[PDB]
From Swiss-Prot, chains A, B:
It comes from Oryctolagus cuniculus (Rabbit). PROSITE patterns: ACTINS_1, ACTINS_2, ACTINS_ACT_LIKE. The keyword Nucleotide-binding applies. GO terms for cellular component: actin filament; actin filament bundle; cell body; cytoplasm; filamentous actin; filopodium; lamellipodium; skeletal muscle myofibril. The gene is ACTA1. The modification ADP-ribosylarginine is found at residue 150. Actins are highly conserved proteins that are involved in various types of cell motility and are ubiquitously expressed in all eukaryotic cells. PANTHER family: ACTIN. This is Actin, alpha skeletal muscle. It is an enzyme of class 3 (hydrolase). Residues 83-96, 331-343 are annotated as: Interaction with alpha-actinin. It comes from the Eukaryota.
Length: 345, 345
């Protein structure tokens, strides 16, 4: 009766802890600091692990520094982005079994876990983090891969934009340290307008939408239409020069690519996952926009769990603990025996 | 548990004492007197040791005459000017280990120690003494060498100028003894004008800025705009026929040569070191001038420690005593073993 580990590796944050817990004990940056003779590196670009040696370092820091546990004494549940290439998943397995000597392991799809966290086996998930946005449709637990929509625009991109659009008010946020200041602003004051034009007009004509922000040094600053113009990019990505359709449109597209029988259920089950879905008013805006694109008689529902910055991790805590999941693990025996081509079944 | 020595060799003064002390016990002229059959020699020109046999004499006078200690019984911390040539540093090491038989030693950068004395690991230092003026930017303890600005104009040059500009009032300061009298005037009455033209006008139209000076022989003399015209040379070196940009401009230039990420911090951390930064009102003038050249939204701060004539020495007292510095010493064993090429790492 040993304890299972759940480690959710995202582009910005690593979320880690023990299965069965309500929340992860460790939440820290997915970064590997390097010198010029910091110079940070984000090992995971757009939800995909791009540098493996750096990634080994984060896992090493997860077990020994953060969780303070022995890797070979706990079965480990890792998480991956939707449509992660085969070879990527095999490499994770190779590293855990050989370099960390884990007794058992399994790699789960992030969007699916989020759904599970909402108590659902079927629905369409909007998972938008720091590095990538996905629309993942799911039926009876299985993610339909031909219907998944990806969008390389998330929190970091929204932070970069807000830095830009604060410069036109006269402020000067350009450094990496100053960027973390803007990220805080984004997380504290930004919201999604129910109707952009109206909202731009309310900002143009009055000061009712202005808020004060106390900087580290003690000075206070004012921000206006930026509050909703920043997260608006989600609905209109051409603000930052991207022709990609908005999140609401890709949600519609994700649903239309699916079998007709399941769409009614998908529409009825729009779960939101990830930190970039935490903007106040994002739930009302998605309802509105989804209604416009859909047929008139469709019942639309957008589920937005309050703890949705950690829905994935939670999904894995719940899964790792389930009785029906224990059979699906990969023992070190199975791996050494069967090999990398066993993590597909 | 033997006591460590700290010896700061400057162009004008030698500052020496035991690590852990608040202030150095010995402060004396960096001069070697010679005859015509005095004729003084300053062994250190512009912060660089130029005559080694004379320099041996000052170190001999430091240990035996001034500090009254045995060189081979104390690890010795020497100081050097920014961008001191490799070969210069190797020669210091050779002399301490072979001629003074020191058990351990280390050579530190003056501007960096000053910073440490202010309780900072990062910032931009204005170190202006009797022979040289440097702008030294520093990040996480390391002095960025490509961003250091040098300026061969300090206290002695300001003293030579004041002797010149007192002649146009009718006084006759020309001899070496009389020069030390002018240096005293410079140190007692000179200040830096917040605005030169205004100040020249206040001197032209009234006598509110005049001060009396009691000479050695008992007679009193009056000095006016010279009080601020002398130190003004720092901000406008073309007063003494030098095309070099002023201290405020080189401070700006030193910052712009650095990586963009660190400039905000550099501006926020302008520490002043050396006797030529002791002019009353030099802190207000640097704030003013630095603001004009910088962007409008930049927070500028000029730190001016009251004990800043001995900031370097103090920096070394603090460093020599640190726990993390003990590993960085150079034992006589290491030197005799490894050789001169070990003092670079
Ligand atoms: N209240 C908030 N409002 C808006 N954005 C937020 C809020 N809280 C967190 N974020 C953003 O959420 C992002 C991190 O969330 P997370 O879902 O953990 O991303 P990730 O998993 O690290 N990377 P990815 O693989 O793209 O999910 C950052 O861009 C945060 O700034
Ligand atoms: N109150 C003062 N006002 C102006 N100048 C001063 C004052 N006190 C000392 N000085 C000058 O400070 C200089 C000596 O300071 P110091 O920083 O010890 O120079 P140094 O280290 O001997 N030579 P360097 O290697 O150039 O620093 C002399 O030119 C003094 O006249
Ligand atoms: C509370 C918090 C949340 C977070 O998500 O940080 C992550 C990680 C962070 C790493 C680089 C910074 C300097 C190091 C320190 C961080 C502490 C964690 C900060 O880079 C992000 O900020 C990026 C860049 S700017 C943005 O919008 N996303 C996301
Ligand atoms: C209190 C004091 C401070 C000092 O800094 O002296 C140093 C050393 C001094 C050496 C020559 C004189 C005669 C010898 C005696 C000195 C006693 C120390 C005098 O030559 C300076 O004066 C030069 C020349 S004139 C000037 O402006 N810098 C700087
Ligand atoms: Ca994620
Ligand atoms: Ca568009
Ligand atoms: Ca000096
Ligand atoms: Ca000039």
């Amino acid at each position: 009766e040993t304890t299972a580990l759940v480690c959710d590796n995202g582009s910005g944050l690593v979320k880690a802890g023990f299965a069965g817990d309500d929340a992860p004990r460790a939440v820290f940056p997915s970064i590997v600091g390097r010198p010029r003779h910091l110079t940070l590196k984000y090992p995971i670009e757009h939800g995909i692990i791009t540098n493996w040696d750096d990634m080994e370092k984060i896992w090493h820091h997860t077990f020994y520094n953060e969780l303070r546990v022995a890797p070979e004494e706990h079965p480990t549940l890792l998480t991956e982005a939707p449509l992660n290439p085969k070879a990527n998943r095999e490499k994770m397995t190779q590293i855990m079994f050989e370099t960390f000597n884990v007794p058992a392991m399994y790699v789960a799809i992030q969007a699916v876990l989020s759904l599970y966290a909402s108590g659902r086996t079927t629905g369409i998930v909007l998972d938008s983090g720091d590095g990538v946005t996905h629309n993942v449709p799911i039926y009876e637990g299985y993610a339909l891969p031909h219907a998944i929509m990806r969008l390389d625009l998330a929190g970091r991109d929204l932070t970069d934009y807000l830095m830009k659009i604060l410069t036109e008010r006269g402020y000067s946020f350009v450094t990496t340290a100053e960027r973390e200041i803007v990220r805080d602003i984004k997380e504290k004051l930004c919201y999604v307008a129910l109707d952009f034009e109206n909202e731009m007009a309310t900002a143009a004509s009055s000061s009712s939408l202005e808020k004060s922000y106390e900087l580290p040094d003690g000075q206070v600053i004012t921000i206006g239409n930026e509050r909703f113009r920043c997260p608006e990019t989600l609905f209109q990505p051409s603000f930052i020069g991207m022709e990609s359709a908005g999140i609401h449109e890709t949600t519609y597209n994700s649903i239309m690519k699916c079998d007709i029988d399941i769409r009614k259920d998908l529409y009825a089950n729009n779960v939101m996952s990830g930190g970039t879905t935490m903007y106040p008013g994002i739930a009302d805006r998605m309802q509105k926009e989804i209604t416009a694109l859909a047929p008139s008689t469709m019942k639309i529902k957008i589920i937005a769990p309050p703890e949705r910055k950690y829905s994935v991790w939670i999904g894995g805590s719940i899964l790792a603990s389930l009785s029906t999941f224990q059979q699906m693990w990969i023992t070190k025996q199975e791996y050494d025996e069967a090999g990398p081509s066993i993590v597909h079944r």
